[PDB]
Amino acid sequence: SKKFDIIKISLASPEVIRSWSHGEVKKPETINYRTFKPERDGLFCAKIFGPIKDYECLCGKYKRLKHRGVVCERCGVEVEQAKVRRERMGHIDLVCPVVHIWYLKSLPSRIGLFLDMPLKNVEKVLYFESYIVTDPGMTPLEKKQLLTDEEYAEALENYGYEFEASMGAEAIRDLLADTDIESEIELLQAECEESKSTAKKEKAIKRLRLLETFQASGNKPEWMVMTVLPVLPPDLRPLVPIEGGRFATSDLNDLYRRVINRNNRLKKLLDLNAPDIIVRNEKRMLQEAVDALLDNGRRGRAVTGSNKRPLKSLADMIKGKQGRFRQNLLGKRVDYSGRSVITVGPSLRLHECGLPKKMALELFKPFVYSKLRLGGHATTIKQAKRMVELEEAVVWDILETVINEHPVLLNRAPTLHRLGIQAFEPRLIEGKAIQLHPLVCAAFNADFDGDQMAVHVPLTVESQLEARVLMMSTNNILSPASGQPIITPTQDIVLGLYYITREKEGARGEGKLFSSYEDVSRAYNSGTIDIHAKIKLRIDRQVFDTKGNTYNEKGVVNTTVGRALLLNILPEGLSFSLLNKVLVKKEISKIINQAFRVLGGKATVVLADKLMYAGFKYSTLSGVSVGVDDMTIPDNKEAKIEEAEKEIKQITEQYQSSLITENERYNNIINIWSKTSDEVGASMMDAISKDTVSINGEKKEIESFNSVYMMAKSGARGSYNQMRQLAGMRGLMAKPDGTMIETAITANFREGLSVLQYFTSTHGARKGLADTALKTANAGYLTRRLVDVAQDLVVIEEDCGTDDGLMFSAIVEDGEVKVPLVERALGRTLAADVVTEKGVVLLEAGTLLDENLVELLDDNGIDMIKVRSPITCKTRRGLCAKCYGRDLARERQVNVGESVGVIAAQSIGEPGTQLTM
Amino acid sequence: MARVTVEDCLDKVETRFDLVVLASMRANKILKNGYSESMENEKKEKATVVALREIAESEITSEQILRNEIEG
Amino acid sequence: LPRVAELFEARRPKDAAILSPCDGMVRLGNRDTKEKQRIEIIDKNGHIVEEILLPKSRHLVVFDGEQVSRGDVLADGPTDPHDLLKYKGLEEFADYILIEAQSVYRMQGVVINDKHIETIVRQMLRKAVILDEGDSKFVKDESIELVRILEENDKLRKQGKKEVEYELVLMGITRSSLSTESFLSAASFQETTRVLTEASINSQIDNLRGLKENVLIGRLIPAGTGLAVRKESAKIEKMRE
DNA sequence: TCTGACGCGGC
DNA sequence: GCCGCGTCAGA
Ligand SMILES: [Mg+2]
Ligand SMILES: [Zn+2]
Ligand SMILES: [Zn+2]
């Protein structure tokens, strides 16, 4: 097949471990001290693991092309590329066997479950604390019978031979060895055929599975106790020398250098026939070092080096956030990248971005090299490198022609949803900061107070076409979470529009007549008319109907000088009835949505272009600004406070003579201050949103043109609460818990506060400020979990054929519908048909709803239908293209290949950074 | 986005994924044919977009495109 | 947020309620030792009693006599998440979950289509407990893919050979995460020591078949343009053949 | 801190 | 067959 296509894991017999070994390690040596060459047969022996340079032995004799596959003879060195010092293991010979820590302390202990004994009973045997019958013998003892030293002595006294009870790893290994399976499987399966698994045989269930597995695989169960353990290629635990004439060992070198000389001393002891006490001590010290090497800290007080850190053992490299899996397998600091500070650049188009010519010169350098060479301005590579180092003039031209249509990527650090990454088309700029079209700073969730973006380049022909087709900003209009658009004008693009789209009663040129847009333009530039005047315009243009018709519309309409100025940008196809209103944000979004759903996708991006280009223009000819007299304190504030404080004195009276309790006094005081603050707040609304003027004839109230009122009646930036705290009064400040303080703050920000009043507020200030930082890790946690749960849900097949789903209905909450049926079930296909209460069918099974057909549900009075949920698909390990419905991001039936699971995962926890309580 | 976009191409081929693979095959073919005679790629666009234009103008009929792989 | 957390990880909250799928009488009369039982069997047509022990430190949710159905509320409090799956069926559980989650979301200005929530719910429902020993073992947990394939193996090969009887079980999201098949993805997620040392015994094979494995080894993931390739290139064979 | 899954010991 | 007390595993 030439490509492996399965991966399997298994236990390593001591005959496989030798088969891996290109040698054997014998003395705990790493590198000679005076000269830094490897040592004979230590932990860097070039005879075993490989050479150091390329095609060159250590003693340097065999150094010529004549002899390549040759094996030197002064040093045992081979001759081959040094690249084998990372794929060539070794091994170590163990005098006495030693238990693989994992299969003992993994909870549940597979050794324990096998031998059917409690762990501590095993560890006692292992720690040289008892004995255990290995030879049954005629003696009445039991095999797995722990015997203390003196009871063992008495067994020796009364029975002598005919039974052996050894202590140490050899004991466990012998037991596991002489443990027949077919003697045991059925014998236990019969006790399980005696099923009374209320408490007893709720235990015996696993041993079945374990003993069956060990039979099925073909693994000798005694292999869980090692007799020879391997070593790791040296270039995975290097000893490279670095500045300061010093070296940088790895923590593994030390644990290896320990296990080795402990094994050595053990062999020497066994040789010299020492007393059994120190034999025991060595045989135990060895087990300890082995366990430390595997993963120290599982059982003891894990060893530390001079710096007193717990060492980074073997297993501690492939777990944890800093480990090996989610650090360097899904990590990978990549190349062809850069990062800098973002700035605005309101001249671009929705598919462009600034790019400092320096970062451009850097990221594209090899492309520049190729084009110079082929261009015939340099012939070598050193040539081009030496001519780019000095920034020749032709370099800039060739760079600019390199990137004519070579998109890049842009990304902002906390990347919560797929709109966190989009593709643009660069264009050179001077300076040292990235510019990006403003209409997208909502997707990247960016603002220009210092955020920095990264930029990666695609290289292939498939990639840099996949970025073009699936990733360019002009494809991402609607949000995957919900069909609502994502590129709507945001902050003062909205101020200007709302401003020039209002009306005024007595203005200049009022009631005039104009034939077409150019007329109004010519007029308005002459400076006679007020832009808020009411005029009459005669229009004539096509309009698209719902059903694909396109009927003509004409006549005279009473409009405003401002709105007509927007008549130019509206493309042919949409009715003027959209622009002919006051144009707060909720309507600009309406315009864009309507445009997309009927006219196309490109029409929408061009429309948003012109909308920005105009809103920016007219939002500065109006010079909106903010003084301090624009914040108008209401007039009845002092007396409205006097009433409240008098009532408070009265409540304190009712208490002081013990006429009322405490808690009720507290609660009623709370309500007093709350209601009065509400009143004084509601007052300034009329005190700032209305302005009367003795217009010709009399004084009549009109909607004010105040600045701070317009900044918030247009949803641009603000809300009623901030206005309250500016002009009204702060009110109730909750001490850390949330229990309100029995003194409210009567002043406001235009008036300033006394020391105590500020202090009372800093409590909640700090609490709310600290509560975000202590969340920023939690939502990421939840979305991580969710991505795991459903990472492999892919739309794979058109239809699953089934006919079962769920029953949907408007989700009343006893006080309101709060979600209509005609909105809950939009764009989701129908399980079965639907019968009128008069009898005739209305909609058939398998009929994807649509805002045309979704009239026919509230029309005929229906309140329950059956739709195809993915809970009730019928395909295995996937999803059909119908039990899921509309893509809700491109307004079509889901194309086959959209990884729906990931989208749904990150469209749940993403807004979670905001939902707090 | 100079002249042609995905919204155009999506009318003939479908699912917007098949577009990627088909255009990639076509651009590879146009690339390996030595079109890089270097007096043209400095006056016009990269083949990666030439292929998209070719698919938009409905010249190639991707049913045909695959039949150029057997021509490999 | 932690409310949502509780919803997803399938937590049975503190002292929610009790149920009884053995319809019958509704009464008391057993020993009043915080072990109050009932007469939930017929006791007239079928002389039996099918009740369970329970304390007496609260109120009650039935009178001295009633026609108690199979799975009605027998004590007030929250609603367990593990009961509805086996008592009210599937769809009731689904409706409960959606009306909870979309409420806790919309109540803060957010907007989220349901079809995102349900395609998460779906992955919490990949495991059942087996009843009829067709060829697998007893009530141990098993995949619905495993059952749904081996059932169909027997379904026509031999005769149907009395394939399977099972019942869906509800497990949390982390619990349904680690309990997958591919040992590679599970080993990447968390608790690596345990999963590695467990799969080491069973000589576990792992067909790649997923998204977080072709990435560990650098292959076209089996989605997106990957399936587009596996389709278009496959369509070349039928021509050149 | 926790929250639990999972224990495995007193009775 | 269970009321409290542990370890492990992630925050
Ligand atoms: Mg910022
Ligand atoms: Zn030599
Ligand atoms: Zn389906």
PDB file of N, CA, C and O (backbone and C1' of nucleotides) in Angstrom, chain E:
ATOM      1  P    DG E   1     -27.624  -7.835  49.438  1.00  0.00           P
ATOM      2  O5'  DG E   1     -26.790  -6.480  49.264  1.00  0.00           O
ATOM      3  C5'  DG E   1     -27.432  -5.298  48.804  1.00  0.00           C
ATOM      4  C4'  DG E   1     -27.774  -4.378  49.963  1.00  0.00           C
ATOM      5  C3'  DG E   1     -27.372  -2.923  49.766  1.00  0.00           C
ATOM      6  O3'  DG E   1     -28.346  -2.063  50.337  1.00  0.00           O
ATOM      7  C1'  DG E   1     -26.208  -3.833  51.632  1.00  0.00           C
ATOM      8  P    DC E   2     -28.329  -0.490  50.007  1.00  0.00           P
ATOM      9  O5'  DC E   2     -27.677   0.173  51.311  1.00  0.00           O
ATOM     10  C5'  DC E   2     -27.239   1.534  51.285  1.00  0.00           C
ATOM     11  C4'  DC E   2     -26.617   1.923  52.617  1.00  0.00           C
ATOM     12  C3'  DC E   2     -25.931   3.293  52.642  1.00  0.00           C
ATOM     13  O3'  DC E   2     -26.339   4.031  53.792  1.00  0.00           O
ATOM     14  C1'  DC E   2     -24.432   1.605  53.391  1.00  0.00           C
ATOM     15  P    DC E   3     -26.659   5.603  53.673  1.00  0.00           P
ATOM     16  O5'  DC E   3     -25.680   6.283  54.740  1.00  0.00           O
ATOM     17  C5'  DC E   3     -26.081   6.386  56.100  1.00  0.00           C
ATOM     18  C4'  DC E   3     -24.933   6.859  56.974  1.00  0.00           C
ATOM     19  C3'  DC E   3     -24.355   8.230  56.614  1.00  0.00           C
ATOM     20  O3'  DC E   3     -24.053   8.947  57.816  1.00  0.00           O
ATOM     21  C1'  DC E   3     -22.641   6.629  56.589  1.00  0.00           C
ATOM     22  P    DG E   4     -23.164  10.286  57.784  1.00  0.00           P
ATOM     23  O5'  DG E   4     -21.656   9.747  57.819  1.00  0.00           O
ATOM     24  C5'  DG E   4     -20.571  10.645  57.597  1.00  0.00           C
ATOM     25  C4'  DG E   4     -19.254  10.041  58.057  1.00  0.00           C
ATOM     26  C3'  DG E   4     -18.027  10.843  57.672  1.00  0.00           C
ATOM     27  O3'  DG E   4     -16.941  10.524  58.522  1.00  0.00           O
ATOM     28  C1'  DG E   4     -18.143   8.876  56.356  1.00  0.00           C
ATOM     29  P    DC E   5     -15.624  11.446  58.515  1.00  0.00           P
ATOM     30  O5'  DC E   5     -14.592  10.670  57.565  1.00  0.00           O
ATOM     31  C5'  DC E   5     -13.592   9.843  58.139  1.00  0.00           C
ATOM     32  C4'  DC E   5     -12.647   9.311  57.081  1.00  0.00           C
ATOM     33  C3'  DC E   5     -11.760  10.358  56.406  1.00  0.00           C
ATOM     34  O3'  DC E   5     -10.468   9.801  56.173  1.00  0.00           O
ATOM     35  C1'  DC E   5     -12.977   9.210  54.778  1.00  0.00           C
ATOM     36  P    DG E   6      -9.136  10.621  56.540  1.00  0.00           P
ATOM     37  O5'  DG E   6      -8.318  10.661  55.168  1.00  0.00           O
ATOM     38  C5'  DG E   6      -9.010  10.663  53.924  1.00  0.00           C
ATOM     39  C4'  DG E   6      -8.814   9.345  53.199  1.00  0.00           C
ATOM     40  C3'  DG E   6      -7.773   9.366  52.092  1.00  0.00           C
ATOM     41  O3'  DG E   6      -7.260   8.041  51.901  1.00  0.00           O
ATOM     42  C1'  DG E   6      -9.864   8.992  51.139  1.00  0.00           C
ATOM     43  P    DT E   7      -5.985   7.778  50.960  1.00  0.00           P
ATOM     44  O5'  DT E   7      -5.636   9.225  50.376  1.00  0.00           O
ATOM     45  C5'  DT E   7      -4.544   9.401  49.495  1.00  0.00           C
ATOM     46  C4'  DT E   7      -4.896   8.914  48.108  1.00  0.00           C
ATOM     47  C3'  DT E   7      -4.298   9.732  46.965  1.00  0.00           C
ATOM     48  O3'  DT E   7      -3.896   8.860  45.927  1.00  0.00           O
ATOM     49  C1'  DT E   7      -6.589   9.582  46.686  1.00  0.00           C
ATOM     50  P    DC E   8      -2.780   9.316  44.868  1.00  0.00           P
ATOM     51  O5'  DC E   8      -3.499   9.128  43.452  1.00  0.00           O
ATOM     52  C5'  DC E   8      -4.903   9.289  43.357  1.00  0.00           C
ATOM     53  C4'  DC E   8      -5.362   9.290  41.915  1.00  0.00           C
ATOM     54  C3'  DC E   8      -4.611  10.238  41.002  1.00  0.00           C
ATOM     55  O3'  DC E   8      -4.834   9.872  39.647  1.00  0.00           O
ATOM     56  C1'  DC E   8      -6.736  11.130  41.505  1.00  0.00           C
ATOM     57  P    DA E   9      -3.953  10.524  38.476  1.00  0.00           P
ATOM     58  O5'  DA E   9      -4.899  11.648  37.852  1.00  0.00           O
ATOM     59  C5'  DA E   9      -6.025  11.281  37.071  1.00  0.00           C
ATOM     60  C4'  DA E   9      -6.895  12.492  36.781  1.00  0.00           C
ATOM     61  C3'  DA E   9      -6.134  13.740  36.388  1.00  0.00           C
ATOM     62  O3'  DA E   9      -5.909  13.728  35.000  1.00  0.00           O
ATOM     63  C1'  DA E   9      -7.866  14.254  37.965  1.00  0.00           C
ATOM     64  P    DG E  10      -5.310  15.024  34.271  1.00  0.00           P
ATOM     65  O5'  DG E  10      -6.596  15.904  33.945  1.00  0.00           O
ATOM     66  C5'  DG E  10      -6.464  17.293  33.760  1.00  0.00           C
ATOM     67  C4'  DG E  10      -7.775  17.995  34.049  1.00  0.00           C
ATOM     68  C3'  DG E  10      -7.646  19.469  34.363  1.00  0.00           C
ATOM     69  O3'  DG E  10      -7.658  20.226  33.181  1.00  0.00           O
ATOM     70  C1'  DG E  10      -8.868  18.457  36.073  1.00  0.00           C
ATOM     71  P    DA E  11      -7.097  21.728  33.205  1.00  0.00           P
ATOM     72  O5'  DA E  11      -8.372  22.606  33.593  1.00  0.00           O
ATOM     73  C5'  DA E  11      -8.204  23.877  34.193  1.00  0.00           C
ATOM     74  C4'  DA E  11      -9.360  24.171  35.120  1.00  0.00           C
ATOM     75  C3'  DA E  11      -9.196  25.412  35.987  1.00  0.00           C
ATOM     76  O3'  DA E  11      -9.795  26.528  35.362  1.00  0.00           O
ATOM     77  C1'  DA E  11      -9.540  23.566  37.359  1.00  0.00           C
TER      78       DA E  11
END
